[PDB]
Design an enzyme around this catalytic site. Structure first.
Site, PDB file in Angstrom:
ATOM      1  N   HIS A   2      -7.722  -5.792  -0.653  1.00  0.00           N
ATOM      2  CA  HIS A   2      -6.468  -5.078  -0.302  1.00  0.00           C
ATOM      3  C   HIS A   2      -6.000  -5.563   1.082  1.00  0.00           C
ATOM      4  O   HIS A   2      -6.827  -5.759   1.960  1.00  0.00           O
ATOM      5  CB  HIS A   2      -6.744  -3.572  -0.328  1.00  0.00           C
ATOM      6  CG  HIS A   2      -5.589  -2.664  -0.115  1.00  0.00           C
ATOM      7  ND1 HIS A   2      -4.530  -2.581  -0.998  1.00  0.00           N
ATOM      8  CD2 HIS A   2      -5.302  -1.793   0.873  1.00  0.00           C
ATOM      9  CE1 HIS A   2      -3.640  -1.724  -0.565  1.00  0.00           C
ATOM     10  NE2 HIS A   2      -4.099  -1.182   0.584  1.00  0.00           N
ATOM     11  N   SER A  56       0.832  -1.192   0.000  1.00  0.00           N
ATOM     12  CA  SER A  56       0.000   0.000   0.000  1.00  0.00           C
ATOM     13  C   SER A  56       0.880   1.261   0.000  1.00  0.00           C
ATOM     14  O   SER A  56       1.710   1.408  -0.882  1.00  0.00           O
ATOM     15  CB  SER A  56      -0.977  -0.043   1.163  1.00  0.00           C
ATOM     16  OG  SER A  56      -1.990   0.935   1.023  1.00  0.00           O
ATOM     17  N   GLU A  88      -9.051  -5.740  -4.909  1.00  0.00           N
ATOM     18  CA  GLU A  88      -8.444  -4.767  -4.016  1.00  0.00           C
ATOM     19  C   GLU A  88      -9.489  -3.891  -3.327  1.00  0.00           C
ATOM     20  O   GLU A  88      -9.433  -3.728  -2.111  1.00  0.00           O
ATOM     21  CB  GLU A  88      -7.485  -3.840  -4.756  1.00  0.00           C
ATOM     22  CG  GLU A  88      -6.220  -4.557  -5.235  1.00  0.00           C
ATOM     23  CD  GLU A  88      -5.077  -4.528  -4.249  1.00  0.00           C
ATOM     24  OE1 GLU A  88      -4.082  -5.221  -4.547  1.00  0.00           O
ATOM     25  OE2 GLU A  88      -5.152  -3.800  -3.212  1.00  0.00           O
TER      26      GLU A  88
END
Length: 494
Positions: free
Chosen positions: A407, A194, A310
Site C-alpha cells: 500500500h 487510500s 497492499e
C-alpha cells in the site's frame, strides 16, 4: 532563474514562484479558518484581502497524531500543524491558458496526511503533462469527522462529513479561480489514494460535489473503504467525547477544548479506522456503492486500481503477517471478515508458498482493497461509464522484499517524485523504478487530458468490461491481464 509570479484570485492577489518552466503557489486559502464558531461547523469562503498575499510557503497541516509507520522507514519529520489548515497548492506551466486540472486528495485514514507532503509535488506532472495540479488540506480526525448530530443536535448537522465538505469547498474554489492559474474549470479530474480515494468515492455519491469534476482516479481505495453508518459513527463519537471529557450537549466545552486534545481522544480509542465519512443522509444520502449501482456516476470516467501486496505495509507495525502463528492470524482475519474467515482461510492457505501469514496477506488485501476496487469498476461498467482498471506490481526491495508491492508504494510513481526526499527509502534505489514511474505518470496525465489512460509507452489498454475484465498491469514489462481476480471473486461469492 527563480522569480516571483503574482496571480489575482476572486479574494485577492497571490505571490508564487516560477523558474519559467513551471510555477507554484503554496498556502493559498480556499476557506476561512475553521476556528471558534467555525469549528465543528461547515467551511466558509475566505475573507477577501487587500495587498499581495505570500504564496511562497505551505500552509500548516490539520492537527494529527504522529502516525509514524511510513515516517519510521522514511526520514520524515512531524508535520507543522494548526487548526487553521484550510489551504491548497497549485502547480501550473503558466498563468495563461486553459489546461486540464488534476486535484489530489491525500490519504492517511482520515486522521493524518497533508497536501504539503513533498511526494505530492505537482511540478513534474505539470511540466511533463502541460496540466494544472492542485493539492489540498481537509480537516482530519475529530475536527473533520466527529458525528455530533445526536450529542449536540441539529446545529451540528453534517458534522460527520466536515472533511468532505472542505474537499467540496476546495473544488468550488478551483471552479471559481483556476482560470487565473492557467487551468480549465470544465476539465477537472479528482485523484486520491487510500482515504483520499475513499474521499473520491464519497464525492461521486455526494450531491453537493456534483458537476465539480468530470473524471476520477481511485488508487488503493474506494467508496467501500472507511464509510460509517450514522449509528456506528454516533457510538464512536460518544467514546471520543468521553476521552475528551466533553459532556454531550456542552457547547462551551466543545469549542473550548484544544485541538491536540481531540487528537489524543481519538488516539485513545486505539488503532484502526474509527473515523470516516458518514451516511448522514445529507452530505452523504446513501452508501457510495449504492449510488454507483444506481448510476450516479454514469457520466464520469474512472481509473481504479490496487497494488499487488497492499496489506504487507501493515507488517511494519505488526509482524505476525511474516509468521506462521495460526491463532494470531485467525484473530486478525476474523476482525476484518467475521464469519466468512474460516472458509476463506482454507482457500488462501492452499494457494501460494511460504509462511501462513504470507499466504493470508492476499485475503486481507482482497477484503480491504480489491473488493472495493472491483465493485467500483463493475458498477461503472454496468452503467456504461468508461472505466479502466490497473494493478501495480513493481516491488520495493527494502527490508528483504517482505513489503512487495505494498500500500502507498505507487504514489511516487504516479507523481514522478521518486527522487524526492524519503521516497527512495520506501521504493528502494533500483534504476528500473524510473521507467515504471514514467508509464504510470503519463497514463495519469493522459486520463486527465483526454479521459483515456492509454499512451504510446503502454501496450493497448482496453476499457474494463464484465466479459473480459481487462486490467493493466504495471510491471517491468507492462501487460494487460484479463480477469486476474477470477478465482478469488468466485470463492468470495461462494
Amino acid at each position: 532563474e527563480l522569480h516571483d509570479v503574482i496571480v489575482e484570485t476572486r479574494y485577492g492577489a497571490v505571490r508564487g514562484r516560477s523558474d519559467g518552466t513551471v510555477c507554484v503557489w503554496k498556502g493559498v486559502p480556499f476557506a476561512r479558518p475553521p476556528v471558534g464558531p467555525l469549528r465543528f461547523r461547515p467551511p466558509e469562503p475566505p475573507e477577501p484581502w487587500s495587498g499581495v498575499r505570500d504564496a511562497t510557503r505551505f500552509g500548516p497541516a490539520s492537527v494529527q497524531p504522529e502516525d509514524r509507520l511510513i515516517s519510521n522507514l522514511t526520514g520524515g519529520a512531524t508535520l507543522p500543524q494548526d487548526e487553521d489548515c484550510l489551504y491548497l497548492n497549485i502547480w501550473s506551466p503558466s498563468p495563461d491558458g486553459r489546461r486540464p486540472v488534476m486535484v489530489w486528495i491525500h490519504g492517511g485514514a482520515y486522521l493524518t496526511g497533508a497536501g504539503s507532503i513533498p511526494w505530492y509535488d505537482g511540478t513534474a506532472l505539470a511540466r511533463e503533462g502541460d496540466v494544472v495540479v492542485v493539492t489540498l488540506n481537509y480537516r482530519l480526525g475529530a475536527l473533520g469527522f466527529l458525528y455530533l448530530e445526536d450529542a449536540f443536535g441539529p446545529e451540528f448537522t453534517g458534522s460527520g462529513n466536515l472533511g468532505i465538505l472542505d474537499q467540496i469547498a476546495a473544488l468550488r474554489w478551483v471552479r471559481e479561480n483556476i482560470a487565473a492559474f492557467g487551468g480549465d474549470p470544465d476539465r477537472v479530474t479528482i485523484f486520491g489514494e487510500s482515504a483520499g480515494a475513499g474521499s473520491v468515492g464519497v464525492l461521486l455519491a455526494a450531491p453537493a460535489a456534483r458537476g465539480l469534476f468530470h473524471r476520477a482516479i481511485l488508487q488503493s481505495g474506494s467508496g467501500a473503504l472507511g464509510v460509517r453508518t450514522a449509528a456506528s459513527a454516533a457510538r464512536v463519537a460518544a467514546r471520543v467525547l468521553q476521552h475528551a471529557g466533553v459532556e454531550p450537549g456542552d457547547r462551551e466545552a466543545l469549542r473550548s477544548l484544544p485541538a491536540r486534545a481531540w487528537a489524543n481522544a481519538v488516539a485513545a480509542l486505539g488503532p484502526g479506522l474509527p473515523l470516516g465519512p458518514v451516511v448522514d443522509g445529507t452530505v452523504l444520502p446513501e452508501h457510495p456503492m449504492a449510488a454507483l449501482a444506481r448510476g450516479a456516476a454514469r457520466d464520469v470516467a474512472v481509473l481504479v486500481g490496487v497494488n499487488k501486496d497492499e496489506y504487507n505495509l501493515f507488517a511494519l507495525q505488526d509482524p505476525a503477517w511474516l509468521g506462521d502463528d495460526e491463532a494470531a492470524l485467525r484473530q486478525r482475519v476474523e476482525a476484518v471478515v467475521g464469519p466468512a474467515a474460516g472458509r476463506l482461510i482454507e482457500f488462501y492457505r492452499s494457494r501460494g508458498e511460504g509462511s501462513l501469514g504470507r499466504r493470508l496477506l492476499p485475503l486481507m488485501s482482497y477484503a480491504v482493497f480489491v473488493r472495493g476496487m472491483l465493485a467500483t469498476a463493475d458498477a461503472q461498467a454496468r452503467v456504461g461509464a468508461p472505466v479502466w482498471a490497473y494493478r501495480f506490481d513493481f516491488e520495493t526491495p527494502v527490508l528483504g522484499g517482505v513489503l512487495g508491492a505494498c500500500h502507498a508504494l505507487e504514489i511516487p510513481f504516479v507523481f514522478n517524485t521518486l527522487d524526492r526526499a524519503g521516497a527512495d527509502r520506501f521504493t528502494g534505489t533500483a534504476p528500473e523504478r524510473y521507467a515504471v514511474a514514467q508509464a504510470m505518470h503519463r497514463a495519469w496525465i493522459a486520463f486527465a487530458r483526454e479521459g483515456n489512460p492509454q499512451h504510446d509507452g503502454l501496450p493497448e489498454w482496453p476499457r474494463y468490461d464484465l466479459e473480459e475484465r481487462a486490467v493493466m498491469v504495471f510491471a517491468v514489462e507492462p501487460r494487460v491481464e484479463r480477469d486476474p481476480w477470477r478465482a478469488e471473486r468466485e470463492v468470495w461469492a461462494a
